[PDB]
PDB file of C-alpha atoms in Angstrom:
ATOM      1  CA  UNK N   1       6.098  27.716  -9.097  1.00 62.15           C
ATOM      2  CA  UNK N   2       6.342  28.332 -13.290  1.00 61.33           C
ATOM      3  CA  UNK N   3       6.067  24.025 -13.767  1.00 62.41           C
ATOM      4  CA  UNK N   4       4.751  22.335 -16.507  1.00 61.54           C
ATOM      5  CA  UNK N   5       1.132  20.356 -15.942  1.00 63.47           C
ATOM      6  CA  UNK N   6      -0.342  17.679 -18.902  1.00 62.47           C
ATOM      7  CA  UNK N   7      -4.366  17.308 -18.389  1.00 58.83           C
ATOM      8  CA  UNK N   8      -5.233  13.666 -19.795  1.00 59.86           C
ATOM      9  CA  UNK N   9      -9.051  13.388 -19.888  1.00 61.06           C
ATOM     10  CA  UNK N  10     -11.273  12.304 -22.652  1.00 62.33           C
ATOM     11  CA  UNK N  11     -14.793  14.667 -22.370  1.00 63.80           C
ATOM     12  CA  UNK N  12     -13.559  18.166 -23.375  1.00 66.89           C
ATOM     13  CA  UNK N  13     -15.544  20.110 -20.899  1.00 68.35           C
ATOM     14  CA  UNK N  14     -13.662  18.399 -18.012  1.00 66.97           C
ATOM     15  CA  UNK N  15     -10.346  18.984 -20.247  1.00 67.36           C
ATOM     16  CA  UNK N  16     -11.847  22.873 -20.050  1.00 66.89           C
ATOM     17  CA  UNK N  17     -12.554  22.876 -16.754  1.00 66.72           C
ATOM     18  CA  UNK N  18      -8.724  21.516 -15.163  1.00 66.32           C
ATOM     19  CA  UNK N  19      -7.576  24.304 -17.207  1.00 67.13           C
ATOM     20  CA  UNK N  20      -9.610  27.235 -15.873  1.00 67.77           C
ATOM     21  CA  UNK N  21      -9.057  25.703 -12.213  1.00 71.87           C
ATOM     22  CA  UNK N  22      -5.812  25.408 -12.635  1.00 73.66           C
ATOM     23  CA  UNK N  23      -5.261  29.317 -14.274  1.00 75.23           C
ATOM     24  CA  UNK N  24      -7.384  30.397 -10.914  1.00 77.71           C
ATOM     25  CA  UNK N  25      -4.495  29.033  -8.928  1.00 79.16           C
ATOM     26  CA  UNK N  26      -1.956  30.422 -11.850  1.00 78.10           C
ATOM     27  CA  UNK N  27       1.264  29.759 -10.404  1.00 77.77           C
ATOM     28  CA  UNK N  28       1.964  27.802 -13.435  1.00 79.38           C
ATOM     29  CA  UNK N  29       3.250  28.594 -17.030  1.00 75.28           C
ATOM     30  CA  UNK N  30       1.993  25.642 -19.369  1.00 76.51           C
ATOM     31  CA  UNK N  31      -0.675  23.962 -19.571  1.00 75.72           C
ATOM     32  CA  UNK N  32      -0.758  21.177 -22.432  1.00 72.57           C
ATOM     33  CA  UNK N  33      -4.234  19.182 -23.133  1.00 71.78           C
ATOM     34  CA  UNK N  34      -4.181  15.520 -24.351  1.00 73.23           C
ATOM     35  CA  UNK N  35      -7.398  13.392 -24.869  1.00 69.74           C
ATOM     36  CA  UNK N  36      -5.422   9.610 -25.168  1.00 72.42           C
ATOM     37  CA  UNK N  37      -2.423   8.267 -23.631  1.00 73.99           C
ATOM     38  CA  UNK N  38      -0.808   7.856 -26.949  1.00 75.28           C
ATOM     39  CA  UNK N  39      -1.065  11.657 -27.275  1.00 74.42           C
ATOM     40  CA  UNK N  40       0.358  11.831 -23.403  1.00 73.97           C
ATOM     41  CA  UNK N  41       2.910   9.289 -23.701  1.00 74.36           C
ATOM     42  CA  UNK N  42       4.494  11.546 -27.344  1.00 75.82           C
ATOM     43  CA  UNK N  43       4.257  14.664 -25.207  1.00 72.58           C
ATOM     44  CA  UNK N  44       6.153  13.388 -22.142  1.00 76.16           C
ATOM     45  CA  UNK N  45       9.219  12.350 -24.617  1.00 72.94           C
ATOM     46  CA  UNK N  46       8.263  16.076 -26.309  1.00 73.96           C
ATOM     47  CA  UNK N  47       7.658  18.759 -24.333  1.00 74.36           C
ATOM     48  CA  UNK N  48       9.266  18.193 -19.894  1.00 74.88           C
ATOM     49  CA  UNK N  49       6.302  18.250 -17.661  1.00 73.24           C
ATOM     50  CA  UNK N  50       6.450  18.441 -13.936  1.00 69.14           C
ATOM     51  CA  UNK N  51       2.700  17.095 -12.878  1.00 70.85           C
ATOM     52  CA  UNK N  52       0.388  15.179 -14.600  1.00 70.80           C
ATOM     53  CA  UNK N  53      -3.602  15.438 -14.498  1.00 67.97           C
ATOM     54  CA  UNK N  54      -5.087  11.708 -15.524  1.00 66.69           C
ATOM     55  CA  UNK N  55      -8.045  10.227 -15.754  1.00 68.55           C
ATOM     56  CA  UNK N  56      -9.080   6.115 -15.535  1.00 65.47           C
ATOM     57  CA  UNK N  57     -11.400   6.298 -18.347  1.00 67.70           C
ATOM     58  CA  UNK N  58      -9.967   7.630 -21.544  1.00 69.77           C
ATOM     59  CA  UNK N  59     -10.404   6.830 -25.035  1.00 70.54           C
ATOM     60  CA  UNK N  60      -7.762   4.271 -25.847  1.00 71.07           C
ATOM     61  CA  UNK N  61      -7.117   2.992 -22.831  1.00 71.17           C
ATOM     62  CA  UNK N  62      -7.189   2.632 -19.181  1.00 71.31           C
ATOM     63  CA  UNK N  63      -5.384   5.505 -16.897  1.00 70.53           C
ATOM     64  CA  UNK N  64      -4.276   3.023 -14.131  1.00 74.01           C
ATOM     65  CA  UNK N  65      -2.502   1.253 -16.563  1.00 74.52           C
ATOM     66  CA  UNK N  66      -1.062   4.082 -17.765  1.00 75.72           C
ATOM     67  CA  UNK N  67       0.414   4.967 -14.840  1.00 76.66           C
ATOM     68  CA  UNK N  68       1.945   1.693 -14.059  1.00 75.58           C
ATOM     69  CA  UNK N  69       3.919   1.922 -16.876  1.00 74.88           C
ATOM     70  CA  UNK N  70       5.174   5.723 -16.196  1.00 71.20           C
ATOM     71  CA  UNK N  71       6.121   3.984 -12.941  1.00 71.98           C
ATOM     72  CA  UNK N  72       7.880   1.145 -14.265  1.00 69.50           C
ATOM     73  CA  UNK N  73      10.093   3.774 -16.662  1.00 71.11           C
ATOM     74  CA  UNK N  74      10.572   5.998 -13.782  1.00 71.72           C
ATOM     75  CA  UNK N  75       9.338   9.269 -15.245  1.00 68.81           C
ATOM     76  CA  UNK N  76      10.296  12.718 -13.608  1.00 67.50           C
ATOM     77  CA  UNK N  77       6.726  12.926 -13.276  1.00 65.86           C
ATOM     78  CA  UNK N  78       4.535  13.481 -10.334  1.00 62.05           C
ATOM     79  CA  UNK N  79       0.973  12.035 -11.125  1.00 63.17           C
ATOM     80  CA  UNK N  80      -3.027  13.532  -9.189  1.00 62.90           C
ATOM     81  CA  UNK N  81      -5.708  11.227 -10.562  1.00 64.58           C
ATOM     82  CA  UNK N  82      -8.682  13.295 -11.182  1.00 64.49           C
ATOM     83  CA  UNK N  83     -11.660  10.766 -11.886  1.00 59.22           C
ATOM     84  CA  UNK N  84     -14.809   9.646 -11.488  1.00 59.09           C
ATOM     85  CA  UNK N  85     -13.903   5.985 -10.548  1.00 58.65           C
ATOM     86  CA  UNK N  86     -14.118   4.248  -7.328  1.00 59.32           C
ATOM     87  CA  UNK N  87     -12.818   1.581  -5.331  1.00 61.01           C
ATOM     88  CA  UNK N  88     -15.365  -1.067  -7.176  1.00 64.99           C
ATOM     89  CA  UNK N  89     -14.326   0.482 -10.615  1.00 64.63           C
ATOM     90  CA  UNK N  90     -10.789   0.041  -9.885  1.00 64.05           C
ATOM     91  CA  UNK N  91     -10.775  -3.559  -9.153  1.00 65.05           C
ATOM     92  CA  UNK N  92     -13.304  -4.710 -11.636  1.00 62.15           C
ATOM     93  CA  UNK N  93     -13.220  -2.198 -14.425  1.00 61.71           C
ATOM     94  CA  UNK N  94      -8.861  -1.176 -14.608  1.00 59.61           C
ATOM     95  CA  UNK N  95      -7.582  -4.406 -12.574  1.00 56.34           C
ATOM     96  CA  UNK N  96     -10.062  -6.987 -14.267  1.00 59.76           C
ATOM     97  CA  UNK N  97     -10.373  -9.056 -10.844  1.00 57.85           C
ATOM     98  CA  UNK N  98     -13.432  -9.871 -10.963  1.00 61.91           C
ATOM     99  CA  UNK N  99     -15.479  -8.987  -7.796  1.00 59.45           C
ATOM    100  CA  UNK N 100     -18.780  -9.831  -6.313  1.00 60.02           C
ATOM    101  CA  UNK N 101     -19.128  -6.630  -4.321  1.00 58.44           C
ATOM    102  CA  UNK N 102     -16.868  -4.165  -2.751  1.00 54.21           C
ATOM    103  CA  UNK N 103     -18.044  -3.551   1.196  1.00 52.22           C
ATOM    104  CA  UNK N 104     -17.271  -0.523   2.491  1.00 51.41           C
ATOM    105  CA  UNK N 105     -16.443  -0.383   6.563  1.00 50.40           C
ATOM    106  CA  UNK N 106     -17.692   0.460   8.649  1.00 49.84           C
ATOM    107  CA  UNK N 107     -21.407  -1.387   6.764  1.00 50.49           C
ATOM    108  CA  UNK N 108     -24.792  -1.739   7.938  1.00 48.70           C
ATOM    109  CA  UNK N 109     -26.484  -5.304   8.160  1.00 46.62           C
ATOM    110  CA  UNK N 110     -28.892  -4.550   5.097  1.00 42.53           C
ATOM    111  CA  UNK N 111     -25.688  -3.887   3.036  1.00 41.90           C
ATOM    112  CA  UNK N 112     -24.284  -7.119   3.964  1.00 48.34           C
ATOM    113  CA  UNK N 113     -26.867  -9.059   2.665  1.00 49.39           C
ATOM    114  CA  UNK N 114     -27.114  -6.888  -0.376  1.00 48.42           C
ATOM    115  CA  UNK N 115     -23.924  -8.165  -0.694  1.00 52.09           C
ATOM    116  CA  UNK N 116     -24.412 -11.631  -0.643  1.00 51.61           C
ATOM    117  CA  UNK N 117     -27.804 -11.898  -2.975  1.00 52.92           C
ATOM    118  CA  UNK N 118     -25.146 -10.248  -5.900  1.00 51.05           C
ATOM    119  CA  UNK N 119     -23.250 -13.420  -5.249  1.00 47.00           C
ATOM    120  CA  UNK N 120     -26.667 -15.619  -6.275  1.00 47.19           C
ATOM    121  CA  UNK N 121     -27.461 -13.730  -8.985  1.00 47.47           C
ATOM    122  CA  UNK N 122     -23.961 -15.022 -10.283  1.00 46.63           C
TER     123      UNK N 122
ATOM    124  CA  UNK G   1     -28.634 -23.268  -0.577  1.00 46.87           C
ATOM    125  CA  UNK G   2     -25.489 -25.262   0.736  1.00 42.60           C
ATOM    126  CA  UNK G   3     -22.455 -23.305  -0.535  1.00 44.25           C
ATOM    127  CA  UNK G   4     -18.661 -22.658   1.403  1.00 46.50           C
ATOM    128  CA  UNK G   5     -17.204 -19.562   2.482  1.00 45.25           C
ATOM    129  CA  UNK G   6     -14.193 -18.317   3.536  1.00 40.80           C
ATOM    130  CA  UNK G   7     -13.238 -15.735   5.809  1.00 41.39           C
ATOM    131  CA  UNK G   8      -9.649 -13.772   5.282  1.00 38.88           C
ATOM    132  CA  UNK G   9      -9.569 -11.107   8.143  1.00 40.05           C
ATOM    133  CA  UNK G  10      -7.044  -9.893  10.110  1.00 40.42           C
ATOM    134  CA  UNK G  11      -9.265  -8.731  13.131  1.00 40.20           C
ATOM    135  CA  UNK G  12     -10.381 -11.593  15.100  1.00 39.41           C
ATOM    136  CA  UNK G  13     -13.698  -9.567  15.947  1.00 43.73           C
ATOM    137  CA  UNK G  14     -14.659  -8.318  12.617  1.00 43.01           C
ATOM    138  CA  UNK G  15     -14.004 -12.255  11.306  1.00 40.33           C
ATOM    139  CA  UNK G  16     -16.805 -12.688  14.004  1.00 41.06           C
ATOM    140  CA  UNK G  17     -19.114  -9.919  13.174  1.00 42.69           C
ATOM    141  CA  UNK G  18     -18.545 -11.320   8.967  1.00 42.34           C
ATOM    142  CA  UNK G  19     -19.737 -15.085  10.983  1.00 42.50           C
ATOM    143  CA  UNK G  20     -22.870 -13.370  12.395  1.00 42.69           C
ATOM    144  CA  UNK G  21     -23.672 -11.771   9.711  1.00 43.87           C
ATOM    145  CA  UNK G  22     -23.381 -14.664   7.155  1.00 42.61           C
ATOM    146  CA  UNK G  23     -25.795 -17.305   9.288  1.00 45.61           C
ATOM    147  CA  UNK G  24     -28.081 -13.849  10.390  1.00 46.38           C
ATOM    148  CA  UNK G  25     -28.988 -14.984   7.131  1.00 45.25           C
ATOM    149  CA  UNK G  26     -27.749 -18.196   6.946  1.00 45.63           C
ATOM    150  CA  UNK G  27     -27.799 -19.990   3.109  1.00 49.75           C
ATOM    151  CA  UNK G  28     -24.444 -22.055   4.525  1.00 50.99           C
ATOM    152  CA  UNK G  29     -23.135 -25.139   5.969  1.00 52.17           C
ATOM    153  CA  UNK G  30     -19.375 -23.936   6.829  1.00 54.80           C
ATOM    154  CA  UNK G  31     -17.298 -20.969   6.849  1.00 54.74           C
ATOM    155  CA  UNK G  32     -14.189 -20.821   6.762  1.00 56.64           C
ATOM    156  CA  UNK G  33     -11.695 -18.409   9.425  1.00 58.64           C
ATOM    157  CA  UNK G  34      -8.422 -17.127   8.259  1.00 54.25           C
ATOM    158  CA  UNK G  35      -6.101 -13.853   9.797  1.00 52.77           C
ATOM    159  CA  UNK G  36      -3.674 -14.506   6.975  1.00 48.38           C
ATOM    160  CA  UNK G  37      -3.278 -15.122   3.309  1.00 48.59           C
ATOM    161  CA  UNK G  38      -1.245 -17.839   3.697  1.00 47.33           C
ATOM    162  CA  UNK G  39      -3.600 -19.766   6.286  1.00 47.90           C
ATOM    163  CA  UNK G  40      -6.251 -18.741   3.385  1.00 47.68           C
ATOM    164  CA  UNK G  41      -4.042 -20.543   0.285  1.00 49.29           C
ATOM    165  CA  UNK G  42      -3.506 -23.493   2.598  1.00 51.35           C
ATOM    166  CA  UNK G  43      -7.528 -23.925   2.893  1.00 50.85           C
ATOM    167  CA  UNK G  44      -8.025 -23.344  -0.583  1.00 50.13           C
ATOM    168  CA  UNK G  45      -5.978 -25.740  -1.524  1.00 53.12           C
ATOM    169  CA  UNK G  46      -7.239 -27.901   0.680  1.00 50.74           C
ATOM    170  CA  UNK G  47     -11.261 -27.635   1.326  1.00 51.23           C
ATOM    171  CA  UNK G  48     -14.312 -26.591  -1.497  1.00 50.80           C
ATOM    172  CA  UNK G  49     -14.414 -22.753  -1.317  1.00 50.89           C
ATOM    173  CA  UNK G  50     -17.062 -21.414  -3.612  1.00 49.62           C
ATOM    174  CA  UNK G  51     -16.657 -17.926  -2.545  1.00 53.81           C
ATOM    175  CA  UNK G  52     -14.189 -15.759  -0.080  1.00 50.97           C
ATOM    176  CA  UNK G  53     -15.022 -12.230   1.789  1.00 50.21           C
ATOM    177  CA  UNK G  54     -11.398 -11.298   1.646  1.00 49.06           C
ATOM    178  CA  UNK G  55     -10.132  -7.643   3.379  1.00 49.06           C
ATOM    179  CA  UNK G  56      -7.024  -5.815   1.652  1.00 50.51           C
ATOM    180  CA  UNK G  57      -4.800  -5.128   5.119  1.00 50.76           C
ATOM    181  CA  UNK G  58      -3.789  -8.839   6.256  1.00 49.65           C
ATOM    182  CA  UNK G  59      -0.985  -9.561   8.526  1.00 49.93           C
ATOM    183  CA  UNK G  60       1.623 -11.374   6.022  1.00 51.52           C
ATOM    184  CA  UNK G  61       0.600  -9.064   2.436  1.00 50.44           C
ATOM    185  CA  UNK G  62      -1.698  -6.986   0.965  1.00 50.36           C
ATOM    186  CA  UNK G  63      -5.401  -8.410   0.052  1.00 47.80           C
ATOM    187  CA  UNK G  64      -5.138  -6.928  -3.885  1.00 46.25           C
ATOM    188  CA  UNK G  65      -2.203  -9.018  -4.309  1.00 48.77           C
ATOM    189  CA  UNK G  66      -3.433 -11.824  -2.786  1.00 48.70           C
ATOM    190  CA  UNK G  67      -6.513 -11.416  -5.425  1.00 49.94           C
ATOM    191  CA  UNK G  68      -4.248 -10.724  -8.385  1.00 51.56           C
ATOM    192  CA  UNK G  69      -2.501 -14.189  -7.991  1.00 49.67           C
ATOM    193  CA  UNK G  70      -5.936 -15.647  -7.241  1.00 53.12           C
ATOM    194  CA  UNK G  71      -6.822 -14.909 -10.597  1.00 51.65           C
ATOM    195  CA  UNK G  72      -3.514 -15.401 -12.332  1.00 54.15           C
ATOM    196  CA  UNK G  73      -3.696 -18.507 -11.157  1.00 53.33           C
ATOM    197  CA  UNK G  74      -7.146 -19.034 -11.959  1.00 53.06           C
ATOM    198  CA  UNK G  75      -8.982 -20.229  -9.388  1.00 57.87           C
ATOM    199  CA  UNK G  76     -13.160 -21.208  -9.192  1.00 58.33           C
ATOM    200  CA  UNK G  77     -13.772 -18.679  -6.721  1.00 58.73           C
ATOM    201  CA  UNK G  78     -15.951 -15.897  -5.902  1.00 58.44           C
ATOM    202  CA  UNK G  79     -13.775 -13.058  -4.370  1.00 56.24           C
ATOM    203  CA  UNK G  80     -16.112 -10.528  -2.538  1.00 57.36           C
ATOM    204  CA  UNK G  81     -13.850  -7.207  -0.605  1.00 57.03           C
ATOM    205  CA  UNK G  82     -14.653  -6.489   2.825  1.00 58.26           C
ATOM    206  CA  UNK G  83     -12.552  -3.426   3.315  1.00 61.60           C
ATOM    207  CA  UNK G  84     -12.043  -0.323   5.319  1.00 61.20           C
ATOM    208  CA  UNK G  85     -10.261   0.737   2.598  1.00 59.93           C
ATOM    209  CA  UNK G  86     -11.096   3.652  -0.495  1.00 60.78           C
ATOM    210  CA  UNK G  87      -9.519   4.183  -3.701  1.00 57.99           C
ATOM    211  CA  UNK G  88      -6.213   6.586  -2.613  1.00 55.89           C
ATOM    212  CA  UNK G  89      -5.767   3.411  -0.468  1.00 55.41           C
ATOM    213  CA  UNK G  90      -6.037   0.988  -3.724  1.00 58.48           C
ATOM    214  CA  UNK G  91      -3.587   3.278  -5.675  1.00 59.58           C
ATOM    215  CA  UNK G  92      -0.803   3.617  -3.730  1.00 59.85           C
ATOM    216  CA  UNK G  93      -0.894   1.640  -0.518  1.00 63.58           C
ATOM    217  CA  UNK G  94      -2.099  -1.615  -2.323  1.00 60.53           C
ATOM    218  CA  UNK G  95      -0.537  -0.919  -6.217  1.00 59.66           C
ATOM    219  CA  UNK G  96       2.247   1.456  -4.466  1.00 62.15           C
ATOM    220  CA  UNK G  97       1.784   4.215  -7.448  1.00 59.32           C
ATOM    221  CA  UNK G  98       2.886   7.407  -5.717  1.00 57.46           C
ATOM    222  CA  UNK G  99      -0.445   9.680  -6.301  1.00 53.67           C
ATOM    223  CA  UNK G 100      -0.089  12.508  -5.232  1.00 54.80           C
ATOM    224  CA  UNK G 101      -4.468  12.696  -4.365  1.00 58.35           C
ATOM    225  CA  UNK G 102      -7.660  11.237  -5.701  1.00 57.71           C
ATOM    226  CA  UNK G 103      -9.838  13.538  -6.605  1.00 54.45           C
ATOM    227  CA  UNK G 104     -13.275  11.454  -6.670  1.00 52.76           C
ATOM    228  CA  UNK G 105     -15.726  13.075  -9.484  1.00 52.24           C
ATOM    229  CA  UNK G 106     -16.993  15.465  -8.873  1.00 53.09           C
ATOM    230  CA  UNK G 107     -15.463  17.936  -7.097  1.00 56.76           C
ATOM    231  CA  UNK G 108     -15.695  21.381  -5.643  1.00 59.90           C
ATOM    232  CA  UNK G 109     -14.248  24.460  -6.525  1.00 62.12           C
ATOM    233  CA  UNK G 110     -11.952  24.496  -3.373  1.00 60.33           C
ATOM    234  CA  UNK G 111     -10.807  20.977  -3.191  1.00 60.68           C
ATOM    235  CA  UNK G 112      -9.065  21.419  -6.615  1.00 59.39           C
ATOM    236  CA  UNK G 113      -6.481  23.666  -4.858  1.00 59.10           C
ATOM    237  CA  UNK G 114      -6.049  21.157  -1.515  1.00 59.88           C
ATOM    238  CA  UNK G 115      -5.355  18.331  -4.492  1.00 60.59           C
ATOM    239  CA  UNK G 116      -2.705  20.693  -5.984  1.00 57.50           C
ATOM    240  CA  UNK G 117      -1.071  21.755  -2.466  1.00 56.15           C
ATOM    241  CA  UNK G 118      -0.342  18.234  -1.580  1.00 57.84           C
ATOM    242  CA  UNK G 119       1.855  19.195  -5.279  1.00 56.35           C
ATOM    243  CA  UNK G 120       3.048  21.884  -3.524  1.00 58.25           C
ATOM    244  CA  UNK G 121       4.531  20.177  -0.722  1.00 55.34           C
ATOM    245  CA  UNK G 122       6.296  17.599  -3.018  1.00 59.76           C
TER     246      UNK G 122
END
């Protein structure tokens, strides 16, 4: 390969552990760290990197949004979200929409009306 | 007791199944059928909606979007996701972000290297 990957992740363990994953792979020269997106954001104008490793939750801001920016700039850049965030965090938590519940199909009936007593304790 | 729902489905039989379901318990007076967003807007322009069971895959846009402008808008309603679909789905079907994978914390040893073959291949 020999292509540049950025790991942007806030807990430094996680930060530790891309980087030993990725060196047990190895087909890739360097590896740069980054624990905010204003860190990220000076490296891609610095140093050319090929993939990016990102996050949602980092410390200055949110990763989604992040990434609709490096979309809207068109950045050389191709992104793999690594993250502990699902479809209920994405909506509520890095879209701000505002949802009751997020109902996964196929559901059972019990689920369903877990669903709608989180709408009356609203 | 006595509140209004609407249904925003696609699937005629799953809009039935969401119908069952809701008077299975039953806390209602109406609710509310739609297969498309804009047979939804129509309604909620038109009749008291206090909250909607909206999918993300509807026949004239995408669910998310539908939501976003929902909220943009500001409307008094209570937006609750019935949806077959996960977060990959979110990112780059619905928000059209070109991910490469979602890796969903946390992950195994081996699925680090599918998530960076799908690089591979791009």
């Amino acid at each position: 390969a020999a292509t540049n990957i950025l790991i942007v992740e806030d807990d430094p363990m996680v930060q530790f552990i891309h980087r030993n994953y990725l060196e047990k792979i190895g087909t890739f020269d360097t590896i740069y760290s980054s624990e905010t997106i204003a860190d990220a954001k000076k490296l891609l104008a610095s140093r050319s990197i090929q993939l990016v490793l990102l996050a949602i939750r980092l410390k200055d801001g949110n990763g989604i949004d992040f990434l609709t920016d490096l979309r809207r700039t068109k950045q050389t850049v191709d992104v793999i979200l690594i993250t502990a965030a699902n479809e209920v965090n994405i909506v509520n938590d890095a879209l701000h929409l505002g949802v009751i519940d997020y109902l996964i199909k196929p559901f059972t009936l019990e689920r369903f009306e877990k669903s709608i007593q989180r709408y009356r304790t609203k």
